[PDB]
Amino acid sequence: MTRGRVIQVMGPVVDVKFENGHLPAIYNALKIQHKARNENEVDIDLTLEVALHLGDDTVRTIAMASTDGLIRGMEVIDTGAPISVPVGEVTLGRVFNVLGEPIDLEGDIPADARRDPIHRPAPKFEELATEVEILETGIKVVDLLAPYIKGGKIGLFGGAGVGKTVLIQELIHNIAQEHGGISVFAGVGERTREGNDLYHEMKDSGVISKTAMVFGQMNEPPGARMRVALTGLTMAEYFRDEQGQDVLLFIDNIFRFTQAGSEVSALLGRMPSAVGYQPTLATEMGQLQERITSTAKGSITSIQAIYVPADDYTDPAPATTFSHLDATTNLERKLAEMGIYPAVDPLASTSRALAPEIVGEEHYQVARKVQQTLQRYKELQDIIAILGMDELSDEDKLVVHRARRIQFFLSQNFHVAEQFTGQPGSYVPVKETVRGFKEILEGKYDHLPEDAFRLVGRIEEVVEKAKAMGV
Amino acid sequence: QVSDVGTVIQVGDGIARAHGLDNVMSGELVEFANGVMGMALNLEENNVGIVILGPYTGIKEGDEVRRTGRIMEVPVGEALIGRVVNPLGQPVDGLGPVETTETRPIESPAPGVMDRRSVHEPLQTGIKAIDALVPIGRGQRELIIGDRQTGKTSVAIDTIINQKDQNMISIYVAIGQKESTVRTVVETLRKHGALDYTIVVTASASQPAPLLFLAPYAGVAMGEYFMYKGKHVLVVYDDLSKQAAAYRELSLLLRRPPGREAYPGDIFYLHSRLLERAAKLSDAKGGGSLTALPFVETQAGDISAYIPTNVISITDGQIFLQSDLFFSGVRPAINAGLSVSRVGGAAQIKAMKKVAGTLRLDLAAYRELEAFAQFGSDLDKATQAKLARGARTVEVLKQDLHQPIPVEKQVLIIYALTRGFLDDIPVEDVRRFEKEFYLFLDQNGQHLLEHIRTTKDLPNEDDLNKAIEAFKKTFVVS
Amino acid sequence: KGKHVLVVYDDLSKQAAAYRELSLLLRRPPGREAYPGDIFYLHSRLLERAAKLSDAKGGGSLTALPFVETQAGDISAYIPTNVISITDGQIFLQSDLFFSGVRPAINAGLSVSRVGGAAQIKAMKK
Amino acid sequence: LLDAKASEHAARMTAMKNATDNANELIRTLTLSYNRARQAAITQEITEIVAGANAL
Ligand SMILES: Nc1ncnc2c1ncn2[C@@H]1O[C@H](COP(=O)(O)OP(=O)(O)OP(=O)(O)O)[C@@H](O)[C@H]1O
Numbered sequence A: 001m002t003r004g005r006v007i008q009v010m011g012p013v014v015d016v017k018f019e020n021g022h023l024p025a026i027y028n029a030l031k032i033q034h035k036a037r038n039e040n041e042v043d044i045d046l047t048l049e050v051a052l053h054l055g056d057d058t059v060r061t062i063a064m065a066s067t068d069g070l071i072r073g074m075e076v077i078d079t080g081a082p083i084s085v086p087v088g089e090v091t092l093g094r095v096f097n098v099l100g101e102p103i104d105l106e107g108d109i110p111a112d113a114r115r116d117p118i119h120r121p122a123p124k125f126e127e128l129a130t131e132v133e134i135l136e137t138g139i140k141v142v143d144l145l146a147p148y149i150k151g152g153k154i155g156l157f158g159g160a161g162v163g164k165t166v167l168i169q170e171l172i173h174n175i176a177q178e179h180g181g182i183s184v185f186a187g188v189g190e191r192t193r194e195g196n197d198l199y200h201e202m203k204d205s206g207v208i209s210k211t212a213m214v215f216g217q218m219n220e221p222p223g224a225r226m227r228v229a230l231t232g233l234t235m236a237e238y239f240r241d242e243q244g245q246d247v248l249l250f251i252d253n254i255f256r257f258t259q260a261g262s263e264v265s266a267l268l269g270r271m272p273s274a275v276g277y278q279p280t281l282a283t284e285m286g287q288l289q290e291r292i293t294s295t296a297k298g299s300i301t302s303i304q305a306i307y308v309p310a311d312d313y314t315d316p317a318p319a320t321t322f323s324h325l326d327a328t329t330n331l332e333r334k335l336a337e338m339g340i341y342p343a344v345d346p347l348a349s350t351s352r353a354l355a356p357e358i359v360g361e362e363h364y365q366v367a368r369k370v371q372q373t374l375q376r377y378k379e380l381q382d383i384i385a386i387l388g389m390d391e392l393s394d395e396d397k398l399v400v401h402r403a404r405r406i407q408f409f410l411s412q413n414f415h416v417a418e419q420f421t422g423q424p425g426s427y428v429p430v431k432e433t434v435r436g437f438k439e440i441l442e443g444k445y446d447h448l449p450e451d452a453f454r455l456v457g458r459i460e461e462v463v464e465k466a467k468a469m470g471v
Numbered sequence B: 001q002v003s004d005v006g007t008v009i010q011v012g013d014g015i016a017r018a019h020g021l022d023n024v025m026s027g028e029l030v031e032f033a034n035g036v037m038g039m040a041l042n043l044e045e046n047n048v049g050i051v052i053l054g055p056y057t058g059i060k061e062g063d064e065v066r067r068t069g070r071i072m073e074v075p076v077g078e079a080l081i082g083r084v085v086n087p088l089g090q091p092v093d094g095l096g097p098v099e100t101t102e103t104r105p106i107e108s109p110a111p112g113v114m115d116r117r118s119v120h121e122p123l124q125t126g127i128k129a130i131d132a133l134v135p136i137g138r139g140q141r142e143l144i145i146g147d148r149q150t151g152k153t154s155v156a157i158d159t160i161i162n163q164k165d166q167n168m169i170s171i172y173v174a175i176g177q178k179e180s181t182v183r184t185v186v187e188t189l190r191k192h193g194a195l196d197y198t199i200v201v202t203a204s205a206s207q208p209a210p211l212l213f214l215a216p217y218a219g220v221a222m223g224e225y226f227m228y229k230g231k232h233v234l235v236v237y238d239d240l241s242k243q244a245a246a247y248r249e250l251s252l253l254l255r256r257p258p259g260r261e262a263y264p265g266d267i268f269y270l271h272s273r274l275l276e277r278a279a280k281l282s283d284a285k286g287g288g289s290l291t292a293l294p295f296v297e298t299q300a301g302d303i304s305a306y307i308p309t310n311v312i313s314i315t316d317g318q319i320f321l322q323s324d325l326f327f328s329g330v331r332p333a334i335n336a337g338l339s340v341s342r343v344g345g346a347a348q349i350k351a352m353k354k355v356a357g358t359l360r361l362d363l364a365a366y367r368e369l370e371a372f373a374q375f376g377s378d379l380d381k382a383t384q385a386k387l388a389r390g391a392r393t394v395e396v397l398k399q400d401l402h403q404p405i406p407v408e409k410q411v412l413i414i415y416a417l418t419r420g421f422l423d424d425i426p427v428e429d430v431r432r433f434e435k436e437f438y439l440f441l442d443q444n445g446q447h448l449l450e451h452i453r454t455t456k457d458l459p460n461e462d463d464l465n466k467a468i469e470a471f472k473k474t475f476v477v478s
Numbered sequence C: 001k002g003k004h005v006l007v008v009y010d011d012l013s014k015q016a017a018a019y020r021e022l023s024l025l026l027r028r029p030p031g032r033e034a035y036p037g038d039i040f041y042l043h044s045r046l047l048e049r050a051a052k053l054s055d056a057k058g059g060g061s062l063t064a065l066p067f068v069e070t071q072a073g074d075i076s077a078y079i080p081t082n083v084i085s086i087t088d089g090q091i092f093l094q095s096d097l098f099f100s101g102v103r104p105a106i107n108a109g110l111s112v113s114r115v116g117g118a119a120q121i122k123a124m125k126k
Numbered sequence D: 001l002l003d004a005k006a007s008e009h010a011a012r013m014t015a016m017k018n019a020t021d022n023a024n025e026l027i028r029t030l031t032l033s034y035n036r037a038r039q040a041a042i043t044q045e046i047t048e049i050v051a052g053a054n055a056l
């Protein structure tokens, strides 16, 4: 006997009462399957997840779908285990929802296939691997100032409409097509249109043969958006552990998980935190993030796009997620308005891989010199804005002159961006980027106009563009 | 009896609490003895929380509440075309009852990932600036954002009027607007004959907050009826800021903890749930489409506010109307630098792609140069190829209200501007040149217009140049 | 036991956040920025246990180096203000100094030591 | 020399006028930023007070 009754329905939150001595454990999945008895009722097929034990044999749960049509007194069945999703080779090339049910119309999954729970403790201290290796992306600013780490955790920060999706699509284009391992995409809390385009892009490119996708987009209720990332993470963990293979993990917007948790938190009875968030923001985010790690048995490298609400980088959700990342890319609306794409902030972006013993002495020196010149240019901003360039000294004038060129040269033309501008785009190796910035710092190209450095790729293309412009 | 009859315990600020109603279901419609409708929101252990969808002054503690057995629904059908109704579907213009037969739920799931198709069909708004720089496709969600009194409503009215000869059904939803403005909008739509294919849903500022909160959902539910039959629907939400404010008021009356700017946590979900329902259906589902044009009002042009950033992260692009350009006589005041269409480009016809490709960047370059050129010396290229060309471009893109232009005439005038035929025409009479060219094309250039209409491609450049030169010979500079 | 100990707390701000979480889950009323009223007492009683004992007590000592992370360089926030008023000095690290080429990015003007001088040898004093 | 002195004085006058205009524009933008910050601070304070009151 595992039968309960619905007591309260308050949006996504449902209270269920069970018989004494048979309460389900926390995170267990409950099923409601009701057939309409008359014309004043509707059919219901809903799944709930246990969240709290309220006492008096009452359990508070979170619904995975819409709660419309629920009636107090409906029968609830306890499954005795958390949400379980299929794992293995069967998941490759398929598209799943939060519950692990395929949605690609390619057929159902056999009921005897192996399924794993989506809740599990994080890997222990002794199981972790800490080797650092460079992951080349072909993007000048990323490869120069904040190199990505193979097997590490990478986060992309940005406001609304700054270019996170374009950047992650470019990373998929440059890296995933020749990875050789398994790729997993989790489109939590984003546009359904983007998911449809990405699926067709994968099908056309043929990469879908090695890719598993679990979407749960923004049209879902907050309960679904809280758990789809866990489903994708479970699918990735199977490949990491049981097969020891290298895994690419893409998360489209990890901020939506925290936002859905905040939406659910108020109805659960918790008192609000500083900016209305849940008190358990840090604990929940840590429990999610600590499972995404590379171990001795396998490696997972993850790229996550993080939304910044109202362009406020001091917001608690973006602020707390900084400590979980090895390399970060910070996008700014001002650079995008200036026409500089990918609009990466050259000073806010950081990486643990920028060390002399990892990237080489020349690379480190060039990057540090570039950052120093950009910092000086930022310092001179108030004087330039009020009194103009006329009052600066000779040294400062040269600093501004070279800083403009350096800032414009960090922009690049993407393959994905060709649909917007019609320009084919380019892929730049790391050594070419280092040599180009070294030559710029030496004053070799001080005579070229600054407009020739925009969206150019390699350094020779700067000379070609300047020559075409009539210089 | 008691399972279908309730008794009111508390009434206040449009929120009621009732005892009984054992068999009521979440989201069900309930009816008071006064005849006012309500929605069951919270099903607690001993009471039901009800949101009143109307005047709550007639409801007193102890009044009877009875079930209706129906989840939130609105009437739908072709009989609703040409009428003005409230969010509940009740007629408001006073022309009699509406003879609908079907209903649709207020809350419905959006089409899935595999149920959609890429947008590939243009939506001709009849405005040169939009059709040239920020194209809109059928099934796209395009945000229109700007300050107070920047022409947001005029753009939507012109777009609706332009759909007369196209197989498009228009729905205009006014949230929190003044009743007089809605009356005048209905009058001008009737004057231009747009009421043959337009449905108007109104919830004025004097209405209670729940009606303003529910109006956009009623509009989209009405649109979905035609959308799933294989037709194309255009839906305009006149202000999502008013809906956000109404929902904030409703949430704070329920004592829910607020976030930044006192908005509730699910304020993003509120707009995302509504805007995810607009889509371009695949061929397997009939190929219908629904296009949405939400409106957002900013304060002092701040695009970094909470609600504008929430809406921007949902739609497929935004059109920014700038206040100073509007005050300086540039109407419509579209900021080319901040406006962008992610889905557009693939929606434009071949003729418009050829001539309007560089126009966005050219206009942005002129706009940034014209401020810098107020001082210092200037090279001949900047004076001629950039400043004069930008001035001509600005003069061309100007347009009068309620006068949409066919796409072929826009293509021809943009081709004339781009190929330098306007370089010797003085700036002071470019608009008169454009109108006289439109008059000339109706008599001597009919074959070019027909070729553009039939083939959707630019005609041969030789004949087009000959026609442009022939018109240019008889035009008087004055 | 007469030994000398050095203790480093890598994040006191995260400890404060965890304390706020567990206090809100116990339904204790919140203060400013949702922190509990006794947030100062926590850190004050934590950091007062570091001291140098007298000769009668054995002469042992304990040194503490608490860490506080600021948001956009705002040292006027609640937790930084609470912690600054407890310790015997501050060492300020700034990103503008860091990127200007000086590393470690210690701001000598703002940094201060209240027991400075007595903690130096004669050669360093001179 | 006299012509050069006159031109120098005129140039300095024009440069100072332009600097004053730039400073005025900067003040104009900073005022809007200040107003936004003030509204946000008032909202945060009142929300915290009301939450503390409701906690009892
Ligand atoms: N292209 C145009 N040419 C001339 N006048 C125009 C044009 N577009 C709009 N207007 C006028 O500008 C005024 C304001 O325009 P409109 O009402 O469309 O703006 P709005 O942003 O919707 O305003 P509100 O906040 O009052 O609702 C009206 O008097 C309208 O007639």
Ligand SMILES: Nc1ncnc2c1ncn2[C@@H]1O[C@H](COP(=O)(O)OP(=O)(O)O)[C@@H](O)[C@H]1O
Pocket: A158, A159, A160, A161, A162, A163, A164, A165, A166, A167, A341, A342, A414, A417, A420, B313, B340, B341, B342
């Ligand atoms: N590298 C780029 N080149 C050209 N345009 C870009 C680039 N990156 C972004 N954009 C423009 O900015 C917009 C990016 O929006 P999106 O990436 O969806 O932002 P977000 O993912 O933060 O919502 C696109 O519409 C595109 O026109």
Ligand SMILES: [Mg+2]
Pocket: A164, A165
């Ligand atoms: Mg995006």
Ligand SMILES: [Mg+2]
Pocket: B152, B153
């Ligand atoms: Mg208006």
